[PDB]
Amino acid sequence: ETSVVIVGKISFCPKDVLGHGAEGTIVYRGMFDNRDVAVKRILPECFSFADREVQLLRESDEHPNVIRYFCTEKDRQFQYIAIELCAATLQEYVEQKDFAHLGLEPITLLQQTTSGLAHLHSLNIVHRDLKPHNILISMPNAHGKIKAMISDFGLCKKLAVGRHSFSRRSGVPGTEGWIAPEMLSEDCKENPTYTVDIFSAGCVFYYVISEGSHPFGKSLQRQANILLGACSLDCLHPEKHEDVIARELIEKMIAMDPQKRPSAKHVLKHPFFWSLEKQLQFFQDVSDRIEKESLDGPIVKQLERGGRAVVKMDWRENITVPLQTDLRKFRTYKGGSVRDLLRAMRNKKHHYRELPAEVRETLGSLPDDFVCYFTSRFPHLLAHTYRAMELCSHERLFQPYYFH
Template sequence: MEASSSGRSAGRFQPGPALPPASNILPGTGGKPAVVASDEESVGKITYYTNNHLGKGADGIVFRGYFHCDDANKRPAAVKRIELAKQSNADREVALLLQLDDNPHVVRYFCTEKDGQFLYIAIELCAVSLDKCFTKENPFDLRGLNPVMLLQQTMMGLEHLHSHNIVHRDVKPHNILLKDHSDSVTVKISDFGMSKQLADSRQSYSMRSGALGTMGWNAPEVLDESRKVNPTSAVDIFSAGCVFYYVLTGGKHPFGEPYRQTANIMDGKYNLNGLQKDKHEDIVATDLIEQMLNMEPQGRPSAESVLKHPFFWSLEKQLMFFQDVSDRIVNEKLDGPIIQQLESGGQEVVRNNWIKHITAVLRKDLEIRKGAYEEGSVKSLLRAIRNKKHHYHDSPKEVQETLGSIPDDFVSYFTSRFPHLLLHTFLAVRSFAEELTLQHYYLM
């Protein structure tokens, strides 16, 4: 459902500012009572405008309108008009919205009304759908909501669905909405017309329901009629993987142009060239998106696991991870399993000699302890990061200036020079995730 969605803050489960009292005074009228528009229609507590289309949902047309909370107050709403013949679908959608109403990243349901021809579902109104954010003509101001935060909120909404055994089945930019709070923006998942709630103890749903999602955004198992295994919530993860690439590249699709997307999805032919192969952030993003686009549903991460991926780690958490791994391996033997995994493929990580790739000021500072650091070792590079963090305030002023402030500049100093370091280390020590020191970084 496009461009629809209540005032809640961007934080998890935190209430937003109260909605202002409604008024019948239109903006810019100098305080005069509003004139009823010629296209205005009212049904019970819902008013909508037939000439003001917001888009088309899975089961009906969406109009701009209002939800009348009481005689004196009304809230802007997106009003979905559905034919009575599809009432069972509408009832299911409302039931799902009511279940999901306690999450700030799912559109909020207001009410349902009915006349002789249609059902009307009113939900909170949002400013724009994600697919409208990358138009050059009228770009949307995200109010500081960067791509990582946007995708994190999207996954928080999706995780909430999956925790209720609800599969959305139509995740795409059109159904990811942005709620404008004037000083911030919140992501909302919308349009549950194709959604399916799995029965207790079931992990999959039957394809007999006929819901295929949207071509170009649906998972290969939905398209392949020869598959004997029923789809699961992993279909949403695949679609979200496409959305991740779309957001990070400013509107590109991992499976190419629209006329080729379905065939490429069936063949597993994606292209992530819009992400740079030598940039730390893009390397981490590529790893996550490739997991999400796995042709085999069981190979994709859960929504919860996606949210634990280093792609979403703050710079502070990245630094804590480098420090904790270094502390964990400080006394390990060189032929021990964790060191073997860490140093396997390490030459690419340290770029053969990491000491050559740091600034002269830091190199000179580290040379005070001759023999303490090995130039071709990942373990040694992590040790240098750990030591400089611990002794940052004791370091000469020029060293502090070259490393910058902790944690942001400090972490970026190293990851910009060694862009594979975080992902490599994360994957290398994953076998030891059950250890107390590392549990915080992995989904257990």
């Protein structure tokens, strides 16, 4: 005994409220062409912007991590925008989940969000209101997989061709606690640009992997801390390898200097998104790259700068006893050298199949267990090597690992 509203090909039940937007807009569950949709109702004072918004998303190239638009209808009083129906917000995903049964789904979710953002930016569109509440989680497809989608383009700006920045004349679009600091600065000479989205995404990254925390604290003091640069990444412990890599990326995404934030396409290349196999492949390509480099050369000096803390003074003392026994039968590696620890890894990896069964047992299978054997014992190895080998980042061998 429920009621239906039909405006053209868009139908919805007024009792199925999914949320409330800005300016007294309501979102309903509904139907369009017998597809499940979400239906946003807007006011007459919004008809000009909605047509501009719809024209933006109807005309832009489709992308799997940008929400799919279906149809707009107008009646005597309202406009209605139908889009793909989603199961949840990213906010509800983080509140209502336990990241043990998910595995790499949180990181895949952030990589999809970042792909969507890189797609917007390459169309010269700055979102300016990225936040967990308007990153949407799809309904499971026929195979049960889900994905993240960027939505809510009311605050976005399409830069003119040739422009790389926009002026603050419109003021401060955004939501308190996710606004880049250069947006709220009286004495900032440089116009904001695409990197306002990187700062917001950085906060989202930390929000997801911390399962609810914000780099700049609780919501009431959140935006004040941003202006002061008062951030804190406590949930990332500095001696767990996964947390070190995540901290290296996020710190740059939320950096106070906008020009120090990586573009969205840079973010996607970071080791935060590397599989175990690719990390070991990076260690191998590095070890091969520096095998004939002199100890006085710029590449090795960079790699050894701070190296004793990376290898924990003597890495041969921080490995398992069967691998210590096996390393002594051969030429001696220098225990304080990052380069030699990489050389030992490359050598045990290349000769894995002929290693004594005791040594293959403590290393574990190639490549997953093998690489974690080293990264879990030397949690700064990959981050430190990644930063040091930035010198070779324009060479063909290191193209899969960096971005130009």
